[PDB]
């Protein structure tokens, strides 16, 4: 098995979890220690279902920029026995484009699902169901419902979290490493 497949599968085994909130099914990325990230619209409450069990949420932080604009990312600290494998080093320091990215989804309905979203470009502002959102990126791929929280990955880098699409294009919240400091 080659290195790209092996990386995406190992992300799936150790960091990308199938979860459920009252809003439905999502892919969650565990980043390090007990810190994970979800799309803001998943609205995690005081507990969240993670694969086979209900896990309490100790804290949730919705990220905004310096103008107070939504970034569509909620950081949660979980009451789990496990520390996540620390993947912060694979997250770039600044919001980075990529060529030939894969979107990795892991939901009860869409388990270990690989989507060839292609090139990922800077996009910036996005009006996401009435909600202004910054620091987004775009891929020319017709992503669909159920894929939010999916992890945008390319060559050992973890660059985005899927948040929406207009039927011909898909959009992610960009990741940067300082979010998980
Ligand atoms: C992912 C979330 C989802 O499916 O929730 C229930 C519908 C979707 C992904 C897009 C759907 C169509 N194509 C896509 O790739 N994202 C959303 O539905 C966004 C619009 C969720 C949302 C809702 C309210 C405020 C901000 C974002």
Short mmCIF file of C-alpha atoms and ligand atoms in Angstrom, two decimals, residues 26 40-41 72 128-129 143-146 148 162-165, ligand 1:
data_model
loop_
_atom_site.label_atom_id
_atom_site.label_comp_id
_atom_site.label_asym_id
_atom_site.label_seq_id
_atom_site.Cartn_x
_atom_site.Cartn_y
_atom_site.Cartn_z
CA UNK A 26 -21.10 14.45 11.20
CA UNK A 40 -20.27 25.00 13.98
CA UNK A 41 -23.73 24.14 12.54
CA UNK A 72 -17.78 27.75 11.09
CA UNK A 128 -23.55 29.87 4.43
CA UNK A 129 -27.40 29.53 4.85
CA UNK A 143 -20.34 17.60 -2.41
CA UNK A 144 -23.70 16.78 -0.75
CA UNK A 145 -25.58 16.66 2.55
CA UNK A 146 -24.11 14.37 5.22
CA UNK A 148 -20.06 18.17 6.75
CA UNK A 162 -16.11 20.48 5.00
CA UNK A 163 -18.95 22.90 5.72
CA UNK A 164 -21.15 23.37 2.60
CA UNK A 165 -21.73 23.30 -1.16
C1 LIG B 1 -23.25 19.54 5.46
C2 LIG B 1 -24.26 19.56 6.61
C3 LIG B 1 -25.56 18.79 6.34
O1 LIG B 1 -25.73 17.97 5.41
O2 LIG B 1 -26.64 19.06 7.30
C4 LIG B 1 -28.02 18.73 7.08
C5 LIG B 1 -28.51 19.19 5.70
C6 LIG B 1 -23.83 20.32 4.26
C7 LIG B 1 -23.00 20.16 3.00
C8 LIG B 1 -23.68 20.78 1.79
C9 LIG B 1 -25.12 20.36 1.62
C10 LIG B 1 -25.36 20.50 0.12
N1 LIG B 1 -24.01 20.31 -0.39
C11 LIG B 1 -23.07 20.32 0.50
O3 LIG B 1 -21.92 19.99 0.30
N2 LIG B 1 -23.76 21.73 4.67
C12 LIG B 1 -24.90 22.41 4.96
O4 LIG B 1 -26.01 21.92 4.89
C13 LIG B 1 -24.74 23.83 5.45
C14 LIG B 1 -25.58 24.73 4.58
C15 LIG B 1 -25.12 23.75 6.92
C16 LIG B 1 -25.34 25.09 7.61
C17 LIG B 1 -26.60 25.40 8.19
C18 LIG B 1 -26.84 26.62 8.86
C19 LIG B 1 -25.80 27.55 8.95
C20 LIG B 1 -24.55 27.25 8.39
C21 LIG B 1 -24.31 26.03 7.72
#
